[PDB]
């Protein structure tokens, strides 16, 4: 009671919407979602509280493994026991398993504490000091990301031996507290009136209406007559459609567009013809319209919540029968679709089908052949399900029944095929259920990689309670890291009225499943609330006084009790493994740019050097495109690493958390090309030629024999970013948005422009970078051509996974990013990856592009 009221207020606070608002809608679909999902999430919570201590480690601290390890050398490791000042430094092998290291730590403990220990190594897990990261399982140490990272940076792994009893105490502490097909008449509606309409009174108003199954039209669009512009237009007219009521598919949507004619688009609104309980809709419907920026089928099927200002279309859905009409059950659908005729075809016409299912638009006659050979598609080309689904006449209830009968016995498709099936071009609910069914085999790592896309797919859903929401919720309550990012992806969009309800409802259900995590995320939102007020203070102060003055003001404001409490001891929203412990006020600052982004520095005694981390708070900028570009770069990095290619990439964290609000992970010991090239006097890098500056800077960071490895890190990362920016169409590249790490690694930042948004972005080769690759020499084709090789190999690996990028970017069209709104944006990727070409023709083309970029580079070498 007292705890329930408290939990409810904390959820309202966290999700940024009062739960009372859900109740005030007096909406049965909303109410059934809350009840079913609360039950489902509490069941997951109860399952979790009883997990074994290693299972609970898999839940809270899922393994962070190297991409090549998924599906020799000597190493120095520092190991301590929980709450011990003492530590042991010992030499292991990168090929040893954590258990050997633990047995080793236990023998050292037994000799030092003069007692033959009861404790077996099986009773322990290894924590990475001052991080929510553990090393466990039957994997050699080189396979864990943390060890791998330690090996490259030369640093020593610092591990803490944590006992099962301590892990169990964590689990305990974090518990939740105690018949349609007979109706042959054409589909029709009555267009009654419009309310709160705004337009030029010299013009006339028209309502355009159309029936859609996803993107595809179910019949021709039908328009209203030209009624005079006014606030309350009255039509009171029948809009009759060319399609029988019996042929309306389950996921049929009626789409409206109100506009003004002399074309002036005013508003749009959509609705599903069947409700969430599968009942065909009857009665009056007031549709609170969305303003138009003509028909929008991909647009939400729920009304505009701003009922005070919204234009509203009033329509009537006629009572087609004296009793309620429901969409037929699956058993009734399979019955009708059972009855068919199998395609008896010629060896030559069988060859024509193999040619098109292995080939992408088709001519009308090719569709007639794919349809006729639907049984052969199921049995010999199951991966061609998507092509067949697109030839199905979704406006014929019998063709839909024949399609559903096959789909219901269709074998589970690979993950790649299932992602294509989540596209809005497959709106059928049975197709969507099938697609999730084939996605169940996703590993938490694969799931995490595509989570951003699965969250966007939620915007295409017609109903609140769906297989994808249940899937996303079940996977998030089974993995704390999936849970963390599902939360933030939904939270960052609560300011969007079209998704606020759906997203707020998912976050509440999630919270019901993990009370403890809700409190952890509240601690994160509290820190972001203070960073917003701090960034506002900085934005005001900076335009009045100088930068060292505003910086000292920011520090004073951070030194306040409420800022010290809220900004300290939190999990990073960028990475729940990263503990943001003590705020280093003196190290904090902000940028001189328009939005004055804040740079917040942290340290942790327990984590040592690894505890020294930074976050960038941005308010005023939109970080969604950055996050998408950075996730795509990370995807490239994983794909190259699986093919044994490590291009030393830096896919740093980027996370929108609110309205034009988000975080960026600071990469320490890095500087921009512009700052290095300023060629300051009295520096360890000052050059005789500005071309030497960046090489002199690497020289000062990597003394003696260390220079060669820095140059190699530069070359690899350069080849990786050359390919990544080319494939992605990253333009507006200048010296202040390219950085370099002291290790030699080059990386790109600020990705506000991609997919050539519209001009085709050519391949880029910079002479200052070509100069580093060549080890300071004018001619060094040995080093330069090793670079061109890294480029060609990285490019040819991406092309092999070109469909993965296409399917993911197609899913992202749902995000509403202005540079990713239509089909032409995906065309850019098809071109850069030359997917209609052989590997020979594409590499030939890549070479022409790389050589073109070198002739462009030599225009600077001339001087
Ligand atoms: C210069 S800024 O205003 O802070 N903007 C920015 C910085 C960065 C990083 C700097 C060093 O760490 C890696 C990430 C990344 N993106 C942006 Cl857009």
From Swiss-Prot:
Residues modified as Phosphotyrosine: 363
CDD domains in UniProt: C2_PI3K_class_I_beta_delta, PI3Kc_IA_delta
MF (Gene Ontology): 1-phosphatidylinositol-3-kinase activity; 1-phosphatidylinositol-4,5-bisphosphate 3-kinase activity; ATP binding
Pathway in which the depicted protein is active: Phospholipid metabolism; phosphatidylinositol phosphate biosynthesis
Residue intervals of the C2 PI3K-type domain: 183-318
Activity regulation field: Activated by growth factors and cytokine receptors through a tyrosine-kinase-dependent mechanism. Activated by RAS. IC87114 inhibits lipid kinase activity and is selective in cells at doses up to 5-10 uM. Among other effects, IC87114 reduces allergic responses, prevents the recruitment of antigen-specific T cells into target tissue, and affects natural killer cell chemotaxis.
Localisation per UniProt entry: Cytoplasm
Functional note: Phosphoinositide-3-kinase (PI3K) phosphorylates phosphatidylinositol (PI) and its phosphorylated derivatives at position 3 of the inositol ring to produce 3-phosphoinositides. Uses ATP and PtdIns(4,5)P2 (phosphatidylinositol 4,5-bisphosphate) to generate phosphatidylinositol 3,4,5-trisphosphate (PIP3). PIP3 plays a key role by recruiting PH domain-containing proteins to the membrane, including AKT1 and PDPK1, activating signaling cascades involved in cell growth, survival, proliferation, motility and morphology. Mediates immune responses.
Protein name listed in UniProt: Phosphatidylinositol 4,5-bisphosphate 3-kinase catalytic subunit delta isoform
Originating organism: Mus musculus (Mouse)
Organism ancestry: Eukaryota, Metazoa, Chordata, Craniata, Vertebrata
């Amino acid at each position: 009671d007292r705890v329930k009221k408290l939990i409810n207020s904390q959820i309202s606070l966290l999700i940024g919407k009062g739960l009372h608002e859900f109740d005030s809608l007096r909406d049965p679909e909303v109410n059934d979602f809350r009840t079913k999902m609360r039950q489902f999430c509490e069941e997951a919570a109860a399952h979790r509280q009883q997990l074994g201590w290693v299972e609970w480690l898999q839940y809270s601290f899922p393994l962070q493994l190297e991409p090549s390890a998924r599906g020799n050398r000597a190493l120095l490791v520092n190991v301590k026991f929980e709450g011990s000042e003492e530590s042991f430094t010992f030499q292991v092998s990168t090929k040893d398993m954590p258990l050997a290291l633990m047995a080793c730590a236990l023998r050292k403990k037994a000799t030092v504490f003069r007692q033959p220990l009861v404790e077996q190594p099986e009773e322990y897990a290894l924590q990475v000091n001052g991080r929510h990261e553990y090393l466990y399982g039957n994997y050699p140490l080189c396979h864990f990301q943390y060890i791998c990272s330690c090996l490259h940076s030369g640093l020593t792994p610092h591990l803490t031996m944590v006992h099962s009893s301590s892990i169990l105490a964590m689990r305990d502490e974090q518990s939740n507290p105690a018949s349609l097909w007979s109706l042959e008449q054409p589909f029709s509606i009555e267009l009654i009136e419009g309310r709160k309409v705004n337009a030029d009174e010299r013009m006339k108003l028209v309502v355009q209406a159309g029936l859609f199954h996803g993107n595809e039209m179910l019949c021709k669009t039908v328009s209203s007559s030209e009624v005079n512009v006014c606030s309350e237009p009255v039509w009171k007219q029948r809009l009759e459609f060319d399609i029988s009521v019996c042929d309306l598919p389950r996921m049929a949507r009626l789409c409206f567009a109100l506009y003004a004619v002399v074309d002036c688009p005013i508003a749009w609104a959509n609705l599903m013809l069947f409700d969430y309980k599968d009942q065909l809709k009857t009665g009056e419907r007031c549709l609170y319209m969305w303003p138009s920026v003509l028909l929008n089928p991909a647009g939400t099927v729920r009304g505009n919540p701003n009922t005070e200002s919204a234009a509203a279309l009033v329509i009537y859905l006629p009572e087609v029968a004296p009793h309620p009409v429901y969409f037929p059950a699956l058993e009734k659908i399979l019955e009708l679709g059972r009855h068919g005729e199998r395609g008896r075809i010629t060896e030559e016409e069988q060859l024509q089908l193999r040619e098109i299912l292995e080939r992408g638009e088709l001519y009308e006659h090719e569709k007639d052949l794919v349809w006729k050979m639907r049984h052969e598609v199921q049995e010999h080309f199951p991966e061609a399900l998507a092509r067949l689904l697109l030839v199905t006449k979704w406006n014929k209830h019998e063709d839909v029944a024949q399609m559903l009968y096959l789909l219901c016995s269709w074998p589970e498709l690979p993950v790649l095929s299932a992602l294509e099936l989540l596209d809005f071009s497959f709106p059928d609910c049975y197709v969507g259920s099938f697609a999730i069914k084939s996605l169940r085999k996703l590993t938490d790592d694969e799931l995490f990689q595509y989570l951003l896309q699965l969250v966007q797919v939620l915007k295409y859903e017609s109903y609140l309670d769906c297989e994808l929401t249940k899937f996303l919720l079940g996977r998030a309550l089974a993995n704390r890291k999936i849970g963390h990012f599902l939360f933030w992806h939904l939270r960052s969009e609560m300011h969007v009225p079209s998704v606020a309800l759906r997203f707020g409802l998912i976050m509440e259900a999630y919270c019901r499943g993990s009370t403890h995590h809700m409190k952890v995320l509240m601690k994160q939102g509290e820190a972001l609330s203070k960073l917003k007020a701090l960034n506002d203070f900085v934005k005001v102060s900076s335009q009045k006084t100088t930068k060292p003055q505003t910086k000292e003001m920011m520090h004073m404001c951070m030194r306040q009790e409420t800022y010290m409490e809220a900004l300290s001891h939190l999990q990073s929203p960028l990475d729940p493994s990263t503990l943001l412990e003590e705020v280093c006020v003196e190290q904090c600052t902000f940028m001189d740019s328009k939005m004055k982004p804040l740079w917040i520095m942290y340290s942790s005694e327990e984590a040592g050097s690894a505890g020294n981390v930074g976050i960038i708070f941005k308010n005023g900028d939109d970080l969604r495109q950055d996050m998408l570009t950075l996730q795509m770069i990370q995807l490239m990095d994983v794909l190259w690493k699986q093919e044994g290619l490590d291009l030393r990439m830096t896919p740093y964290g980027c996370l929108p958390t609110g309205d034009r609000t988000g975080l960026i992970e600071v990469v320490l010991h890095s500087d921009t090309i512009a700052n290095i090239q300023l060629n300051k006097s009295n520096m360890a890098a000052t050059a005789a030629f500005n071309k030497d500056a960046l090489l002199n800077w690497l020289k000062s960071k990597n003394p003696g024999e260390a220079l060669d490895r820095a140059i190699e890190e530069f070359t690899l990362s350069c080849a990786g970013y050359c390919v990544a920016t080319y494939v992605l169409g990253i333009g507006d590249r200048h010296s202040d948005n390219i950085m370099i790490r002291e290790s030699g690694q080059l990386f790109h930042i600020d990705f506000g422009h991609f997919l050539g948004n519209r001009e085709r972005v050519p391949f880029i080769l910079t002479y200052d970078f070509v100069h580093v690759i060549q080890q300071g020499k004018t001619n060094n084709s040995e080093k330069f051509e090793r670079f061109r090789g890294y480029c060609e190999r990285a490019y040819t690996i991406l092309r092999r996974h070109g469909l993965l990028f296409l399917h993911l970017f197609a899913l992202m069209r749902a995000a509403g990013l202005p540079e990713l709104s239509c089909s032409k944006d995906i065309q850019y990727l098809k071109d850069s990856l030359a997917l209609g070409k052989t590997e020979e023709e594409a590499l030939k083309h890549f070479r022409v592009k790389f050589n073109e970029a070198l002739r462009e580079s030599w225009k600077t070498k001339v001087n």
